[PDB]
């Protein structure tokens, strides 16, 4: 019975891990969007028809 | 998806190239007209019946 009761702490810990990963995935959404925009900037800046102000 | 989104920069660059060539073709209209008039001047000046003032 004491062993079954200690599984509540195991469940709390696993739920804590799922919450931590959820926050990481939200930040990762932000970061992959930023990286896509950054690739769009670098791709545009490699064109040589740009003037200096656009670059 | 990030690859599809970066095609917008490719399209911007190709449109920029079409604009650059358009300006060159407008200047080329001017220049071919000038060269035709210049050939008309040289052709008239090669006639030896011209007096010095007309030449």
Swiss-Prot record, chains A, B:
Q: Where in the cell is it found?
A: Secreted; Bacterial flagellum
Family note: Belongs to the bacterial flagellin family.
Job of this protein? Flagellin is the subunit protein which polymerizes to form the filaments of bacterial flagella.
Quaternary structure note: In C.crescentus, the flagellar filament is composed of multiple flagellins of 29 kDa; 27 kDa and 25 kDa.
Q: What is this protein called?
A: Flagellin FljM
Q: Which part of the complete sequence is present?
A: 56 to 110 of 273
């Amino acid at each position: 019975s004491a062993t079954a009761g200690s599984m509540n702490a195991v469940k709390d810990s696993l739920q804590r891990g799922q919450s931590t990963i959820d926050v990481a995935l939200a930040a990762g959404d932000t970061i992959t969007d930023l990286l896509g925009k950054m690739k769009e900037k670098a791709l545009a800046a490699s064109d040589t028809s740009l003037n200096t102000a656009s670059f």
